[PDB]
Write an enzyme that holds these catalytic residues in place. Structure first.
Site, PDB file in Angstrom:
ATOM      1  N   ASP A 158       3.615  -1.144  -6.333  1.00 40.66           N
ATOM      2  CA  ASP A 158       2.353  -0.765  -6.999  1.00 40.66           C
ATOM      3  C   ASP A 158       1.821   0.584  -6.451  1.00 40.66           C
ATOM      4  O   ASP A 158       0.639   0.702  -6.076  1.00 40.66           O
ATOM      5  CB  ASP A 158       1.300  -1.905  -6.938  1.00 40.66           C
ATOM      6  CG  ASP A 158       0.097  -1.715  -7.865  1.00 40.66           C
ATOM      7  OD1 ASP A 158       0.197  -0.903  -8.822  1.00 40.66           O
ATOM      8  OD2 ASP A 158      -0.948  -2.350  -7.618  1.00 40.66           O
ATOM      9  N   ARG A 162      -4.894   4.955  -6.612  1.00 40.40           N
ATOM     10  CA  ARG A 162      -5.840   3.883  -6.291  1.00 40.40           C
ATOM     11  C   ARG A 162      -5.384   3.077  -5.060  1.00 40.40           C
ATOM     12  O   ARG A 162      -6.208   2.359  -4.485  1.00 40.40           O
ATOM     13  CB  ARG A 162      -6.088   2.950  -7.506  1.00 40.40           C
ATOM     14  CG  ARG A 162      -4.860   2.119  -7.894  1.00 40.40           C
ATOM     15  CD  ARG A 162      -5.021   1.173  -9.091  1.00 40.40           C
ATOM     16  NE  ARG A 162      -3.691   0.664  -9.450  1.00 40.40           N
ATOM     17  CZ  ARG A 162      -2.838   1.297 -10.249  1.00 40.40           C
ATOM     18  NH1 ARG A 162      -3.207   2.410 -10.880  1.00 40.40           N
ATOM     19  NH2 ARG A 162      -1.615   0.822 -10.431  1.00 40.40           N
ATOM     20  N   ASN A 163      -4.075   3.179  -4.665  1.00 41.12           N
ATOM     21  CA  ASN A 163      -3.556   2.502  -3.464  1.00 41.12           C
ATOM     22  C   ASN A 163      -3.280   3.501  -2.302  1.00 41.12           C
ATOM     23  O   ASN A 163      -2.465   3.231  -1.403  1.00 41.12           O
ATOM     24  CB  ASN A 163      -2.356   1.587  -3.779  1.00 41.12           C
ATOM     25  CG  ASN A 163      -2.763   0.302  -4.481  1.00 41.12           C
ATOM     26  OD1 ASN A 163      -3.832  -0.283  -4.237  1.00 41.12           O
ATOM     27  ND2 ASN A 163      -1.917  -0.177  -5.372  1.00 41.12           N
ATOM     28  N   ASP A 176      -2.131  -1.606  -0.023  1.00 47.61           N
ATOM     29  CA  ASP A 176      -1.905  -2.498  -1.155  1.00 47.61           C
ATOM     30  C   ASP A 176      -3.075  -3.488  -1.206  1.00 47.61           C
ATOM     31  O   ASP A 176      -3.177  -4.351  -0.346  1.00 47.61           O
ATOM     32  CB  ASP A 176      -0.536  -3.208  -1.099  1.00 47.61           C
ATOM     33  CG  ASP A 176      -0.143  -3.932  -2.388  1.00 47.61           C
ATOM     34  OD1 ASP A 176      -0.966  -3.986  -3.319  1.00 47.61           O
ATOM     35  OD2 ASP A 176       0.991  -4.417  -2.469  1.00 47.61           O
TER      36      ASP A 176
END
Ligand SMILES: CCn1cc(CC(=O)Nc2ccc(Oc3ncnc4cc(OC)c(OC)cc34)cc2)cn1
Length: 298
Positions: A158, A162-163, A176
């Site tokens: 992922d 945003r991470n 995460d």
């Protein structure tokens, strides 16, 4: 394995504060720990824990995250484990280092106006503007962090802006959020079958064949480079994320260059998005290439 004598932190030495963001079955809370890293020294930390609605399944998943963090170990460009509360009579709590500026996507977007490609002397010197140097620097730091994760035989699955969390002195850290992010409300996650998936960041072999490798993390890295050099814009603007989108991506349709990129950084995005996974560069190659661009930018 869980080495208790090392990682176990007493619940009575942790002072919980305000929640940071909103989650589904998990939650991140700001806290102040007493002597977690240095003897008898107060330190602001971030604590990941479960909330009402979570079941035994999420409890097993949070314990798995703690074991993975113990295995990986520390690196400057990864959000590092500081301790945990695992003893009976209280909830499971995973304690990590606090990153004061939050996620990179939100940060870059809020500072989109305070950007100049290069500082021209003398006025620009004392103004805290974001520059091309800063953007190439954050890119190089994420490649270093990902090369370290590959060396420990781990894959992210992922990877996105945003991470990425921003700490002091321009240090960025891979993280995460898991179920401490409400993926059911978040537009970046699309409903595909019985699951909510980050379609705009996924490689074609991941969308069509459910194949996750370090080279599909290279594809997501290419997407992350586009988010940095667009200063926090959303990928594939105006494009409806449906069957036609997946078909076109499988045939070689790619994003147009973002507004704040240089030609060589856009060419790096295209290479990361090679149709064949084996033909994409490695994270070790990306570290070499970005380091040279950072020296050319100086
Ligand atoms: C890739 C390696 N890896 C790491 C994991 C575990 C993991 O990353 N856990 C995790 C993730 C994010 C967390 O959230 C924050 N941590 C620090 N500081 C923050 C500061 C914040 O706002 C100022 C904020 O706001 C929303 C959130 C903050 C806390 C714990 C698994 N694999």
């Amino acid at each position: 394995p869980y080495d208790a004598s090392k990682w176990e932190f007493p619940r009575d030495r942790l002072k919980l504060g305000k929640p940071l963001g909103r989650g589904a079955f998990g939650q991140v809370i700001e806290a102040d720990a007493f002597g977690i890293d240095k003897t008898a020294t107060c330190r602001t930390v971030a604590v990941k824990m479960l909330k009402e609605g979570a079941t035994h399944s999420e409890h097993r998943a949070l314990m798995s995250e703690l074991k993975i963090l113990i295995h990986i170990g520390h690196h400057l460009n990864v959000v590092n484990l500081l301790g945990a509360c695992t003893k009976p009579g209280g909830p499971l709590m995973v304690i990590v280092e606090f990153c004061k500026f939050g996620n990179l996507s939100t940060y870059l977007r809020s500072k989109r106006n305070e950007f100049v490609p290069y500082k021209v002397a003398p006025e620009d010197l004392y103004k805290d503007f974001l520059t091309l140097e800063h953007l190439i620097c954050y890119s190089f730091q994420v490649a270093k962090g990902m090369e370290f994760l590959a060396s420990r035989k781990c894959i992210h699955r992922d990877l996105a802006a945003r991470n990425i969390l921003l700490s002091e002195k321009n240090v960025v850290k891979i993280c995460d959020f898991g179920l401490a992010r409400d993926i059911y409300k978040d537009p970046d996650y699309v409903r595909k079958g019985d699951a909510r998936l980050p379609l705009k960041w996924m490689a074609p072999e991941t969308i069509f064949d459910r194949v996750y490798t370090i080279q599909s993390d290279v594809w997501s890295f290419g997407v992350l480079l586009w988010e940095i050099f667009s200063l926090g814009a959303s990928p594939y603007p105006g494009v409806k994320i449906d069957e036609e989108f997946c078909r076109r991506l499988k045939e070689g349709t790619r994003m147009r260059a973002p507004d704040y990129t240089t030609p060589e950084m856009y060419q790096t995005m295209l290479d990361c998005w090679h149709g064949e996974p084996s033909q994409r560069p490695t994270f070790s190659e990306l570290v070499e290439h970005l380091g040279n661009l950072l020296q050319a930018n100086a």
